[PDB]
Design a protein around this ligand. Structure first.
Ligand SMILES: Cn1ncc(Nc2ccc3c(c2)CCNC3)c(Cl)c1=O
Ligand SMILES: [Ca+2]
Length: 118
């Protein structure tokens, strides 16, 4: 959609973005991504992952109106899942959570884009 690329985010749009974010935070499989990765759970994580991201950081940026275009919001969300699949092996519970939660996000994102005009 060109509106995703070109149209600045409005206060109305941010009500939808908060709804998408809350739906992910409530998802059963979102537990590994609610808060930043604890370095004591993964000692070399922050030397390996250049741009870490988590849902609590995105909650702060949504509240602060940090995002100006929908592309930037999708980019932050995608970092969460791409970081996880790059650091972890395919049989990790974190990796499997990233697979289900990203599919859930795409569903919710399609819903946000569809209703963005009404
Ligand atoms: C490499 N690595 N390590 C952790 C993590 N999340 C995460 C979040 C909370 C808790 C745990 C893990 C384990 C036990 N305490 C609660 C991710 Cl997503 C990751 O990729
Ligand atoms: Ca990526």
């Amino acid at each position: 959609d060109a509106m995703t690329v070109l149209t600045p985010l409005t206060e109305k749009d941010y009500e939808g973005l908060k709804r998408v974010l809350r739906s992910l935070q409530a998802h059963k499989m979102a537990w590994p991504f609610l808060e930043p990765v604890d370095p004591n759970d993964a000692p070399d994580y922050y030397g390996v992952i250049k741009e870490p991201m988590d849902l609590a950081t995105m909650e702060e940026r949504v509240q602060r109106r940090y995002y100006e275009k929908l592309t930037e919001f999708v980019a932050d969300m995608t970092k969460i899942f791409d970081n996880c699949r790059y650091y972890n092996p395919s049989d990790s519970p974190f990796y499997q959570c990233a697979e289900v939660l990203e599919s859930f996000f795409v569903q919710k994102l399609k819903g946000f884009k569809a209703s963005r005009s009404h």
